[PDB]
């Protein structure tokens, strides 16, 4: 469960893990460069959930690496996706191509308990 | 909960997060190269779950990076693992070595709700 | 839910996904190098959960990549964080800077079921 806005996020099928995000305009990424690709996507997630922007296999096989895509529950702005080319030739992304995906997960990073000294 | 087939996936202990995957044959990965390592592993996961192929610390400390390992619930083929060497010397993987692990997670990427305009 | 010890993990807000980890001493990471940054952080998680050490957007935009941060439920030692610089200039981490984050997730990598031959 989430709410979302934007033209650069596609409806997904039920048996996909994530929503596809689409490139806003043509962009070239030469080898070893990093580019920050903007989107107009905004999401709202429920308590103790977070968005994870990660890669699609078709663009990972060309060397596209997404880094830093943890979208906290408190993040209210537009998603920006940090991409580096770790491949061996330039990557050309065309406007409207699917380049990343957004998966919504619950975390359990809350509710600290006392240390069990007998563990192990 | 999952079902799985294949000779390149090991039984795991209960206190590991993931199943180990094993290299099919000896392979060298020179620095800056990417190789796609095939497996004979197939999985079936329940609704709203997905497989994540990710790295083991022992091979990340040598520069092995896995990229693009999201295995949707709809994916019925054999897993292939995309690996790049971001280390500073060649990586030699021997047949039957544990090189990656598969972790099964539930997503919540479904059930869209209306946007809350009062948030924040 | 987890238990944790250490001076290099910060309390978090409820609407963050993860806890921030802090650098132990000043460290330089030249481009293409990998360094293993030690922490004094130890965690205990409940059954079928695991820690994931991953990146913060502010350090991914400079080229800091974290690799191999799956912390099993059986892992009782101090966390060490494997970092590579895939950026285009040196990265300087100062003592006490927030450089990574720890997110606690549940996995479902247990309970094998029979293969459904009719799937698809």
Curated annotation (Swiss-Prot), chains A, B, C:
Protein name per UniProt: Reverse transcriptase/ribonuclease H
UniProt source species: Equine infectious anemia virus (isolate 1369) (EIAV)
Full-protein residues shown: 742 to 861 of 1146
């Amino acid at each position: 469960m989430l709410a979302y806005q934007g033209t650069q996020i596609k409806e997904k099928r039920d048996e996909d893990a994530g929503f596809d995000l689409c490139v806003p305009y043509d962009i070239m990424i030469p080898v070893s460069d990093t580019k920050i690709i903007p989107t107009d996507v905004k999401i709202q997630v429920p308590p103790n959930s977070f968005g994870w922007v990660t890669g699609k296999s078709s663009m990972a096989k060309q060397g596209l690496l997404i880094n830093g895509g943890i979208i906290d529950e408190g993040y209210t702005g537009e998603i920006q996706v940090i991409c580096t080319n770790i491949g061996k030739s330039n990557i050309k992304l065309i406007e409207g191509q699917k380049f990343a995906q957004l998966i919504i997960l619950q975390h359990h990073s809350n509710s600290r308990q006392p240390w069990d000294e007998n563990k192990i």
